[PDB]
Swiss-Prot record, chain A:
The protein's name: Large ribosomal subunit protein eL37A
Pfam families reported in the protein's UniProt record: Ribosomal_L37e
Subunit structure: Component of the large ribosomal subunit (LSU). Mature yeast ribosomes consist of a small (40S) and a large (60S) subunit. The 40S small subunit contains 1 molecule of ribosomal RNA (18S rRNA) and 33 different proteins (encoded by 57 genes). The large 60S subunit contains 3 rRNA molecules (25S, 5.8S and 5S rRNA) and 46 different proteins (encoded by 81 genes).
GO biological process, one term: cleavage in ITS2 between 5.8S rRNA and LSU-rRNA of tricistronic rRNA transcript (SSU-rRNA, 5.8S rRNA, LSU-rRNA)
A Gene Ontology term for the protein's cellular component: preribosome, large subunit precursor
Gene3D superfamilies for this protein: 2.20.25.30
Cofactor: Zn(2+)
Extra facts: Present with 21800 molecules/cell in log phase SD medium. There are 2 genes for eL37 in yeast.
UniProt family annotation: Belongs to the eukaryotic ribosomal protein eL37 family.
Encoding gene per record: RPL37A
Swiss-Prot record, chain B:
Gene name of this polypeptide: RPL19A
Family: Belongs to the eukaryotic ribosomal protein eL19 family.
Subcellular location: Cytoplasm
Leftover remarks: Present with 97700 molecules/cell in log phase SD medium. There are 2 genes for eL19 in yeast.
Protein name: Large ribosomal subunit protein eL19A
Source organism: Saccharomyces cerevisiae (strain ATCC 204508 / S288c) (Baker's yeast)
From Swiss-Prot, chain D:
SUPFAM superfamilies in the cross-refs: Ribosomal protein L39e
GO function term, MF aspect, one: structural constituent of ribosome
Function: Component of the ribosome, a large ribonucleoprotein complex responsible for the synthesis of proteins in the cell. The small ribosomal subunit (SSU) binds messenger RNAs (mRNAs) and translates the encoded message by selecting cognate aminoacyl-transfer RNA (tRNA) molecules. The large subunit (LSU) contains the ribosomal catalytic site termed the peptidyl transferase center (PTC), which catalyzes the formation of peptide bonds, thereby polymerizing the amino acids delivered by tRNAs into a polypeptide chain.
Name listed for the protein in its UniProt record: Large ribosomal subunit protein eL39
From Swiss-Prot, chain E:
Chief location category: cytoplasm
CC annotations in GO: cytoplasm; cytosol; cytosolic large ribosomal subunit; preribosome, large subunit precursor
Keyword field: Cytoplasm, Isopeptide bond, Phosphoprotein, Ribonucleoprotein, Ribosomal protein, Ubl conjugation
The organism of origin for this protein: Saccharomyces cerevisiae (strain ATCC 204508 / S288c) (Baker's yeast)
UniProt protein name: Large ribosomal subunit protein uL22A
Keyword Phosphoprotein in record: yes
Protein origin, superkingdom: Eukaryota
Keyword Phosphoprotein in annotation: yes
Further comment: There are 2 genes for uL22 in yeast.
Boundaries of the shown chain within the full protein: 2 to 155 of 184
Family membership noted in the UniProt record: Belongs to the universal ribosomal protein uL22 family.
Gene: RPL17A
Cross-link Glycyl lysine isopeptide (Lys-Gly) (interchain with G-Cter in ubiquitin) residue location(s): 45
Residue positions, PTM Phosphothreonine: 69
RNA sequence: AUAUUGGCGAGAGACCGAUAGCGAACAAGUACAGUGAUGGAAAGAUGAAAAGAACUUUGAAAAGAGAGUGAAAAAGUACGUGAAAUUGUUGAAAGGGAAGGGCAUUUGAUCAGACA
RNA sequence: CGUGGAGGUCAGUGACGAAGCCUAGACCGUAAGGUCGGGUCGAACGGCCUCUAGUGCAGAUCUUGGUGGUAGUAGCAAAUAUUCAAAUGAGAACUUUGAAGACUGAAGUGGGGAAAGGUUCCACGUCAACAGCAGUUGGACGUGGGUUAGUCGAUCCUAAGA
RNA sequence: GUGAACAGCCUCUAGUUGAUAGAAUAAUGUAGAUAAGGGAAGUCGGCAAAAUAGAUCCGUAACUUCGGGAUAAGGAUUGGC
RNA sequence: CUAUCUAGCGAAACCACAGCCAAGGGAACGGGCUUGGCAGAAUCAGCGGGGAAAGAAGACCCUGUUGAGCUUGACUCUAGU
């Protein structure tokens, strides 16, 4: 059989967890995540995966530093002390 | 009431299997407080629990 | 040598025993209505096999 | 498994501490749209892919 | 507690309503329609004989392909059965309506049943796994039950 | 939105199967898998002559 | 001077008004499937205020019946209104292998007008 | 004729109940459709002159959702097999204990393990749901506890290879 | 233990007694069997089943690459004390 | 062991409306029309004539100024040499 028996010999993974995107896409035998090539410096982004340039783009997450840059610019990147 | 855990613990204590542990039926209200493995030691010597006998396998005909 | 319990820890934060029972019932029921719905809405377009072989030519 | 990593044990710890119901002091909050835990998970239905 | 079309008065009548019950509508409607118009003392005796396999219940509408039997002759039909779950879930409402009546102040010797209607409830749903890797529903047919009893006058 | 309705990858199944020739979503795990799209008739579809 | 479907902040619309409008008005790129690249949903409304049904009684219990709140439980968290298919009880009518329909009229029900 | 919206207008209707809905109750129009009474119900909606359009459905192996007859029907028939008494409980063919009868018959229905799963392991409470019958029972639900390494493994070495 | 044997069957340690059940016994079925005399006349066709079967001794052809064919074929025997 | 009867549980295919026939005409083989024969509630287990039954936008044929795999001295080109 090629079906219900052949789905019994599925017990060794060809993927595991990536350290840069945390999802199961890291191919162990060749050591590349299919969603963001982890040895590679760039992130795997393509203009035909528009619906993949929203699950992984700027604003998807936290923006720990970038949420404050507009708040800093309106005031002029001022430093020092507040006031009296 | 329910004595599956007590029957497990008694067999594990005595060494023999689960099927050679005989509990007295008249002492359920006493056995069911044996939530531990030290009280089972008390009951096996009291006689409320018994190691049954090895079933025979004779070899005389052979 | 114990003072607290899970029910005692939840005592201070609103719910009591009766109210936990009451809330749990409705919570399980409204979790079950969703399963009834999702079964209804999958039962049609789940049996559409992609490459079923249809073992009969003769 | 029996012989595993630490990352997997960490993810399993998170997925164990997330496998509780909704606490009932939430439902009494003044504007609470949350009647139950929708991301609930158990090991029979949904295998988490790690 | 709105009810069906009651052709009687609310002063000398007491009622009951069993909701979202997990018994089959097709085998409960017949149980109700077999007692509509009866006295309680001579219906509770009959529902108790049904469980002991005497005096079966006649199935008049939902009667397709069931087997025949001789306990239908007293109703003229030849197809009957003994549904021992609908029987119990109706007998656990006759008792409650009789209690309601005893607390209202109505003598329980002339009580008869005037209105009883079974309804169709939301189905509680499952799956059953068929051949060739497909799925089909395997669900229930619950029922609301709704009952009114009153005392005979001229 | 010029991309309304066409935020989807969908192709018809064809003949043989006893559904229409409408494009139909592929996949699984939800109730969208199998639904029609790319059409004016279909829920979650576009409109006829999207107003420019 | 020109361009700008991205980002930040503003203002408007002969636009859609929950099967519509961005996929998403809500804990939506979430749940979920797929080894993976990727695919990808459904789901809004109690009421002015929870005042969310004290208390009695039947039941083993859920719940039921009274009670009570409320302007209204024909608003009781399955909660705005609550349609159709379909379905239960009651009532009316008919019924020899079809039912339904057109013209005309008897019988019954219902409506009509005082022309006071 | 009708529908969603827009500019004018009736100093229009309306919580003393607008819209919507049911109405083998009535009226007008050849008809599209319009008007009225009754019941329900709870907040906005109409008539006229005009403008504009995402504007009228019986079908499209139409799309989404929902419900039917079929039907209390087919059926829940592989793996030798169950029975008696008691206890619990509201309730016991299916729980527990005891007494019996049997089987897997050591290339096992045993004991342990690699992958894989992920807390299912154990206790207490518990049955609205799942266990295609039931259920006091449960890998189910709710709350908690639990995995101790100088010597066991990873770690270290290198192979085909990357 | 039987036996050549981790075969088949029975049993001890250990485990389980779980698969929804009850009553009745009609056809037609699935699985398993028997059959008077005949013995492939059936049928495309001996498809299916049936017989033989293990061990000892004797006896074993044509052909042959001289190694085999060959368990050829075809006979009797088998227990208990 | 099923089927069958019962307690419980409880689907699906399929469905314009549904289901008594002869002949006639007709899209040349009607369940409906026409002329006739007939016709009495509700129904159970079987059955396999029929419902041109269900399955699937014919898998042979033809057309399309629709395609593909393949071959060669078809046309036009080409990496390589
Ligand atoms: Zn990655």
């Amino acid at each position: 059989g090629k079906g219900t028996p052949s789905f019994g010999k599925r017990h060794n993974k060809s993927h595991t967890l990536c350290n840069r995107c945390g999802r199961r896409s890291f191919h162990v035998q060749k050591k590349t995540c299919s969603s963001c090539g982890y040895p590679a410096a760039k992130t795997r982004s393509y203009n035909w995966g528009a619906k993949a340039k929203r699950r992984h783009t700027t604003g998807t997450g936290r923006m720990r530093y970038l949420k404050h840059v507009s708040r800093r610019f309106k005031n002029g990147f001022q430093t020092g002390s507040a006031s009296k | 009431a329910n004595l599956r855990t007590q029957k497990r613990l008694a067999a594990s204590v005595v060494g023999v299997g689960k099927r050679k542990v005989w509990l007295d039926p008249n002492e359920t209200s006493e056995i069911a407080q044996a939530n531990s493995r030290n009280a089972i030691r008390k009951l096996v010597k009291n006689g409320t629990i018994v190691k049954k006998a090895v079933t025979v396998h004779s070899k005389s005909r052979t | 040598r114990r003072t607290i319990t899970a029910a005692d820890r939840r005592m201070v934060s609103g719910v009591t025993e009766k109210q936990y029972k009451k809330g749990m019932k409705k919570m399980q029921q409204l979790e079950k209505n969703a399963i009834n719905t999702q079964i209804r809405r999958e039962i049609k377009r789940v049996n559409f096999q992609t490459h079923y072989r249809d073992e009969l030519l003769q | 498994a029996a012989q595993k990593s630490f990352r997997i044990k960490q993810k399993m710890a998170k997925a164990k501490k997330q496998n509780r119901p909704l606490p009932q002091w939430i439902r009494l909050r003044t504007n609470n749209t949350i009647r139950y835990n929708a991301k609930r998970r158990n090991w029979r239905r949904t295998k988490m892919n790690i | 507690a709105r009810y069906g079309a009651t052709s009687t008065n609310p002063a000398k009548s007491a009622s009951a309503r069993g909701s979202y019950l997990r018994v089959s509508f097709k085998n409960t409607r017949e149980t109700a329609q077999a007692i509509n118009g009866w006295e309680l003392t001579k219906a509770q005796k009959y529902l108790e004989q049904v469980l002991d396999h005497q005096r079966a219940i006649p199935f008049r509408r939902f009667n397709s392909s069931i087997g025949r039997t001789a306990q239908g002759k007293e109703f003229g039909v030849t197809k009957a059965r003994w549904p021992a779950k609908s029987v119990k879930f109706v007998q656990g409402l006759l008792q409650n309506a009789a209690a309601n009546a005893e607390a209202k102040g109505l003598d329980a010797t002339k009580l008869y049943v005037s209105h009883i209607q079974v309804n169709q409830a939301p189905k509680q749903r499952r799956r059953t796994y068929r051949a060739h890797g497909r799925i089909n529903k395997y669900e229930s047919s619950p029922s609301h039950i709704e009952l009114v009893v009153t005392e005979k006058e001229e | 939105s010029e991309k309304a309705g066409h935020q989807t990858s969908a192709e018809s199944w064809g003949t043989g199967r006893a559904v229409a020739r409408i494009p139909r979503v592929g996949g699984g795990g939800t109730g969208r898998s199998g639904q029609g799209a790319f059409g004016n008739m279909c829920r979650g579809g576009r409109m006829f002559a999207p107003t420019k």
